[PDB]
RNA sequence: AGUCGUGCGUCUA
């Protein structure tokens, strides 16, 4: 019919998206240039992303400047931190394509292969007479070098003698053609791989046929709709899910368009998502699971190998297929990979039949993920794998997209996956958890950093999962009172945590904050980052002090985890406790930033704050509310707080924090070898100080 | 203001 015909052509459109525009935007940027933005346009081109937006077209002329702007800083990052190792290749003849020059070279297989090249891969190209054969090319040079050009790899042909022709797309109107002479070596060193960006300009091009397209310009939730509380009270019994749960899991599934569910960290957020898929499955429909990271996508499928309980509690394990590379992709998932599962399944006349096999053996491969993705009911992935090309080449609608860490990502990346026809869509997030990646601060300045969950809780408020269990009632107290506003309630194990000890002695509590009387900071110009010795002696002794009173009686085996803000002093802190420790520090220990550290929850976790000196008022990143939360809500039982007295309370939030610690009389007074009575120096400075 | 998630492909003479 007219309708079907209609849909048909926009999803060829959206699957089939030209990305000629983003390549001759980005080529047109200069590799060398070292400023906060691509060009010297005027700053007023740049604006706020509006809550609303009138139509398609302001929605792109406002996101287009942002996605340029952190693409630039991508680049930039890549040039400045990563040093890609350079290559030669020799130039050949080149064809005129639209507004553009397809340059064919010819390369080492050995040299690419070790460099890393793709068909997906951004390139700077420049020539270097005076280069001598023996230097060591480096992305110094590239940087510095007068004439430098960016490329993008368009394939990558082998051929007989180990020889790769690939051809290179530039800027048809940039002067560096003129070097381009046949049998010209030319100096390239990769920049980065321009993939999740070019989905992400499809994504945002092809909003318009989205079906979605005004629920997402207005980032208005559907109305609710009652539902029965029989039904949820059934429901609820049948998964043994919470009430506010079932409730909010009914409210979701009942409602067609987005969803918004508020889960705080501990509140059976990946319980929720299986309650949300068991729920779907027992009302063929496939659903896909996009998540920010691998990680995620990793946790879901091992949740869901174990199975999903139906209402009729008939547990059923539908066939899962995960989109992601086995090296990416955790261990124990890679049974659940395409590729694995394929195999699975498949279980010069010689040139001639060789060459026929191997065609006959891609045909096949081809054929049995087909089948497997068009048989599969949940396909588990990350939101730039969701636009990978087998699933547009297969076109096959996605009824319902489930989203998690909706906060942790941005919108282009959240509504990818909705490109495949995703007329229910289902995000899950909590604002209060660390905000999406952005590499660009003056992007984060016109709001680019927020994602389009935070516009969506903005509009209308989402169902906060206020029932948590493994978040001790002390620890979620002050979140609850200032970073949550109220809503939460502590679980039925309020104090019946299995881990019981080392808490009834009084210098181990569920909370703690040991503040520092003196130290200093010192700042390495390399990496810019501060590093304290006071708070890594401090930290190490708490360590052995705990591991002396419970070195036999119990095991730390991947128990107590140290975060810091900074990377350099997480790493100094490793770097010291393997020389103290040892190589029990292996696994007994995770070191890892606060950031990094995200989705990883253990019993004991030390906040480690590096800012100490009163010199400067400024507070970085502690200031932000979200990273606070972030470092609060990973801990279970026993949280150790470092960091200076003053420069923290000149925070307003950490002043606040202080403050109910001092009327909770969870303020210590600590310094170097502060359980250490030999030495006089400590007693002293903390009598002092008292 | 000092850190970070995301992507790629495995047989070719």
């Not at 609820?236 to 919470?242: A, E, P, Q, V």
């Amino acid at each position: 019919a007219e309708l079907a015909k209609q849909e048909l052509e926009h999803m060829r459109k959206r699957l089939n998206v030209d990305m000629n525009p983003l390549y001759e935007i980005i080529l047109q940027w200069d590799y060398t240039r070292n400023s906060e933005y691509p060009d010297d346009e005027p700053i007023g081109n740049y604006s706020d992303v509006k809550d609303f937006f009138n139509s398609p077209a302001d929605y792109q002329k406002v996101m287009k400047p942002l996605l340029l702007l952190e693409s630039w800083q991508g680049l930039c990052s890549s040039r400045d931190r990563e040093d890609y190792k350079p290559f030669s290749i020799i130039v050949g003849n080149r064809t005129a394509v639209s507004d553009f020059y397809d340059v064919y070279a010819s390369v080492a297989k050995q040299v690419i292969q070790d460099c890393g090249i793709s068909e997906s891969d951004l390139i700077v190209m420049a020539y270097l007479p005076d280069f001598r054969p023996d230097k060591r090319l480096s992305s110094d040079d590239f940087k510095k070098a007068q004439h430098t050009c960016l490329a993008k790899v368009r394939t990558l042909k082998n051929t007989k003698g180990g020889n790769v022709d690939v051809t290179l797309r530039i800027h048809r109107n940039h002067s560096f053609s003129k070097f381009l002479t046949l049998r010209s070596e030319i100096y390239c060193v990769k920049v980065m791989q321009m993939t999740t960006i070019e989905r992400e300009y499809s994504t945002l091009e092809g909003l318009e046929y989205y079906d979605l397209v005004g629920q997402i310009l207005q980032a208005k939730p559907s109305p609710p709709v009652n539902v029965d509380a029989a039904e949820i009270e059934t429901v609820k019994k049948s998964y043994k899910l919470n009430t506010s749960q079932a409730e909010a899991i009914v409210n979701s599934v009942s409602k067609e368009g987005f969803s918004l569910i508020q889960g705080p960290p501990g509140t059976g957020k990946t319980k929720t998502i299986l309650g949300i898929i068991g729920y779907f499955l027992s009302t063929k429909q496939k659903i896909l699971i996009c998540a920010p990271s691998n990680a995620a996508v990793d946790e879901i499928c091992l949740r869901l190998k174990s199975g999903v309980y139906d209402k009729q509690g008939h547990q059923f394990k539908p066939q899962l297929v995960r989109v992601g590379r086995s090296d990416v992709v955790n261990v124990a998932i890679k049974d659940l990979t395409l590729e694995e599962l394929v195999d699975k399944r498949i279980g010069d006349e010689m040139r001639e039949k060789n060459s026929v096999n191997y065609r006959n053996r891609d045909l096949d491969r081809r054929n049995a993920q087909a089948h497997i993705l068009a048989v599969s009911d949940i396909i588990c992935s990350t939101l730039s794998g969701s636009a990978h090309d087998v699933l547009a080449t297969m076109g096959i609608k996605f009824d319902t997209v489930i989203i998690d860490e909706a906060c942790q990502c941005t919108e282009l990346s959240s509504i990818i996956p909705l490109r495949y026809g995703g007329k229910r869509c289902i995000m899950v997030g909590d604002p209060n958890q660390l905000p999406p990646t952005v590499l660009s601060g003056a992007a984060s300045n016109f709001k680019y950093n927020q994602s389009l969950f935070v516009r969506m809780e903005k509009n209308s408020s989402p169902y906060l999962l206020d029932v948590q269990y493994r978040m001790h009632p002390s620890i979620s107290k002050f979140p609850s009172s200032e970073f949550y506003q109220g809503r939460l309630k502590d679980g039925p194990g309020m104090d019946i945590l299995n881990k019981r000890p080392w808490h009834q002695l009084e210098p181990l509590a569920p909370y703690k904050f040991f503040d520092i009387i003196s130290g200093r900071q010192e700042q390495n110009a390399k990496t810019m980052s501060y590093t304290n010795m006071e708070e890594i002696r401090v930290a190490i002794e708490l360590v052995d002090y705990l591991f002396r009173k419970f070195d036999n009686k119990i095991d730390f085996t991947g128990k107590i985890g140290i975060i810091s803000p900074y990377r350099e002093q997480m790493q100094k802190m490793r770097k010291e406790f393997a020389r103290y420790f040892g190589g029990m520090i292996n696994k007994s220990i995770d070191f890892n930033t606060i950031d990094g550290f995200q989705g990883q929850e253990k019993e004991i976790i030390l906040i480690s704050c590096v800012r100490a000196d009163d010199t400067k008022s400024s507070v970085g990143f502690l200031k932000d509310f979200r990273r606070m939360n972030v470092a609060l809500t990973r801990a279970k039982t026993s949280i150790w707080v470092l960091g200076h007295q003053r420069s923290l309370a000149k925070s307003k939030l950490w002043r606040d924090l202080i403050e109910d610690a001092k009327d909770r009389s969870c303020l210590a007074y600590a310094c170097s070898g502060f359980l250490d009575p030999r030495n006089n120096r400590a007693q002293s400075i903390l009598r002092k100080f008292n």
